[PDB]
């Protein structure tokens, strides 16, 4: 059974930089779709970034140009890169494998001063 675990950061100040990682095991990592979702305490899960086999990337408009999504096949690890963080980004971030109806990780909280 394929399982995927997040290694995230903690509390960062406004305008700082962060990087989250997610290791996916039991997967055909070179083909499946990977994504980063976020969840505020009130609002439901919202897709933040998506990466696909051809390394094609997508991002929600309200965050395009700030975050980056990358994946290393050899290490089989997906990465989310944070730049110019804002207080509205303080939420629980999850990684996802192959679609919103697929597989999710534990998730890591991120707080912005």
């Amino acid at each position: 059974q394929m399982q995927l675990v997040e290694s995230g950061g903690g509390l960062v100040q406004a305008g700082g930089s962060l990087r989250l990682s997610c290791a996916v095991s039991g997967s055909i990592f070179s083909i499946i779709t990977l994504a980063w979702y976020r969840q505020a305490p009130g609002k439901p899960r919202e897709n933040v970034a998506t990466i696909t086999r051809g390394s094609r990337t997508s991002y929600c408009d309200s965050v395009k140009g700030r975050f980056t999504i990358s994946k290393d096949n050899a290490k089989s690890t997906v990465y989310l890169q944070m730049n110019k963080l804002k207080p509205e980004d303080t939420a629980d971030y999850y990684c996802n494998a192959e679609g919103p109806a697929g597989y999710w990780g534990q998730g890591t909280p991120v707080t912005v001063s």
Partner: peptide, 14 residues
């Protein structure tokens, strides 16, 4: 490579 409903898949931009 993905699974989900039509609207959830039109989100998720995959």
């Amino acid at each position: 490579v993905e699974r989900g409903t039509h609207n959830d898949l039109l989100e998720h931009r995959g």
